[PDB]
Design a protein around this ligand. Structure first.
Ligand code: 56Q
Ligand code: ZN
Length: 507
């Protein structure tokens, strides 16, 4: 119909609901839409002199564990600290390796103090598993209270009359689904264009989507802003619960499923966009598809690996908006793995992982919210969110779809790095089954690393375990030039690793 008539019709549908809201209810919906940011003045006031100085001249970008946002906040802090020096000083202080331990340990605790109070982010990061011990207990309980109260606010459905008469819209950054394919879904040559090849891939793997937080959608399609190249057009179901927000928006109930009906490249004002047509379905319907896929991928890989038929090895921990791609990519990642690694190394190491009740966890929630990590890591400041992780205590590999890794081409290479950690673990075990340690903790590898540790990737300089893993990754790259660079620039490492590989296969 008319944009303005549509708006007024939906507003009227929710008018009694709106008028019945308490001040407390309104305050909650506003806090949901506008997270409470940390006040940087209080943060800085809480630091010691040595800490201000440390923060002042610190190489911030170089973290294993700090998001783009968190990195941006901390430099907002850094400036404020340095906004009292010479104009010459600040000019010098940013023309200038990896992080020191004193720096890293500082940042690991400072991380806990710069988190906004952001209900929708908590829901997305945990995939709705809000009891996950990844934040302070008192704050965790606050989120829970707010979330339950919002759930109780959103009781009125869009209804049987309006649901098939309206579309709702959501503009979205490509990077919010996966930070990888974001940079390469837009044509590098002409930014007004979509990369057709990539797009076809994206399209083929995007069949369903979960919202574990509360979607805020526009009643009328809004022109794209910067980094808004996805334009969702959504059709609700009759019993989808929602609330009217000022300025022609709806907040949708959390835990809904979306079936992707169509993905097209479209033109709006001389730029190409990606239209995504989606229909709201019950979340349980999608969870069913995920569980079925989980069964299928384990059945297939249990066969190919010589494991018992009902080994629980592969876990899909999937709860967010790029859901089906997480499932689809797990298949690809494991194919790359078997393709680029000797089948006897795979089988020996994996059987060891399985012996410890280990998992390959493919997920779209942050890794601190994965049990295979947090059950062994009680201290939040020691919890890690990243593209990938190996956890020896649970013998598990964790791989987070939406993020991008430090100097990493794709997810498959990330996985092979983690498998490298696992090889490190198993070799060390075979050495001394009693006092079971990592082979990169041996005196031999320590000395090899003291000599060759700077010769491979920048990230590899971190420590022995990472050096090994990076070396192991590069040695099993599909690009054979990368393999040779390892033999060339770090010969003892190359030899050491092949030794461990031989040693494992013959055990
Ligand atoms: C290069 C590269 C980077 C990553 S990571 O997830 O970005 N990362 C820094 C983490 C802490 C790591 O060492 N996990 O084992 C993962 C794999 C990989 F090959
Ligand atoms: Zn690593």
């Amino acid at each position: 119909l008319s944009r303005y008539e549509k708006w007024e019709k939906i507003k009227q549908h929710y008018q009694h609901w709106s008028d019945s809201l308490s001040e407390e209810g309104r305050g909650l919906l506003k806090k949901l839409q506008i997270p409470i940011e940390p006040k940087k003045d209080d943060i800085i006031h809480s630091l010691s002199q040595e800490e201000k100085e440390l923060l002042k001249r610190i190489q911030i970008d170089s973290s294993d564990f700090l998001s783009t946002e968190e990195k941006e906040f901390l430099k907002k802090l850094q400036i404020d600290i340095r906004d009292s020096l010479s104009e010459e000083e600040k000019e010098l202080l940013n023309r200038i390796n990896p992080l020191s331990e004193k720096e890293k340990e500082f940042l690991k605790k400072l991380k806990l103090d710069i988190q906004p109070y952001d209900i929708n982010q908590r829901l997305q990061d945990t995939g709705g598993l809000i009891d996950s011990p990844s934040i302070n207990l008192d704050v965790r309980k606050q989120y829970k209270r707010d979330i339950q109260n919002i759930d109780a606010l959103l009781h009125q459905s869009i209804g049987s009359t309006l649901y098939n008469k309206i579309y709702l819209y959501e503009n979205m950054n490509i990077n919010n689904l996966t930070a990888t394919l974001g940079a390469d879904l837009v044509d590098s040559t002409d930014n007004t264009k979509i990369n057709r090849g990539i797009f076809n891939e994206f399209k083929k793997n995007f069949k369903y989507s979960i919202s574990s937080n509360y979607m805020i959608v526009d009643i009328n399609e809004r022109p794209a802003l910067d980094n808004e190249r996805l334009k969702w057009r959504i059709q609700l179901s009759p019993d989808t619960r929602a609330g009217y927000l000022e300025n022609g928006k709806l907040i949708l109930q959390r835990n809904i499923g979306l079936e992707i009906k169509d993905v097209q490249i479209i033109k709006q004002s001389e730029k190409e966009y990606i239209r995504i047509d989606a229909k709201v379905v019950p979340k349980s319907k999608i969870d069913t598809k995920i569980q079925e896929a989980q069964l299928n991928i384990n059945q297939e890989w249990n066969k190919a690996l010589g494991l018992p038929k009902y080994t629980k090895l592969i876990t899909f921990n999937v709860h967010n908006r790029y859901a089906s791609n997480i499932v689809e990519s797990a298949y690809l990642i494991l194919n790359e793995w078997k393709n680029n690694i000797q089948s006897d190394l795979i089988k020996k190491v994996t059987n060891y992982l399985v012996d410890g009740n280990g998992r390959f966890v493919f997920t779209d929630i942050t890794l601190p919210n994965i049990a295979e990590q947090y059950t062994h890591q009680d201290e939040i400041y020691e919890q890690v969110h990243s593209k990938g992780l190996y956890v020896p205590e649970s013998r598990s590999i964790l791989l987070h779809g939406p993020s991008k890794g430090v100097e990493l081409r794709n997810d498959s290479e990330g996985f092979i790095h983690e498998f490298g950690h696992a090889v490190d673990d198993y070799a060390g075990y075979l050495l001394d089954k009693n006092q079971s340690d990592l082979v990169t903790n041996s005196k031999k590898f320590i000395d090899i690393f003291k000599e060759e540790g700077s010769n491979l990737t920048s990230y590899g300089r971190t420590n022995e375990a990472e050096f090994f893993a990076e070396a192991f990754r590069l040695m099993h790259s599909t690009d054979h030039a990368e393999r040779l660079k390892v033999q060339k620039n770090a010969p003892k490492t190359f030899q050491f690793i092949n030794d461990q590989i031989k040693f494992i296969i013959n055990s």
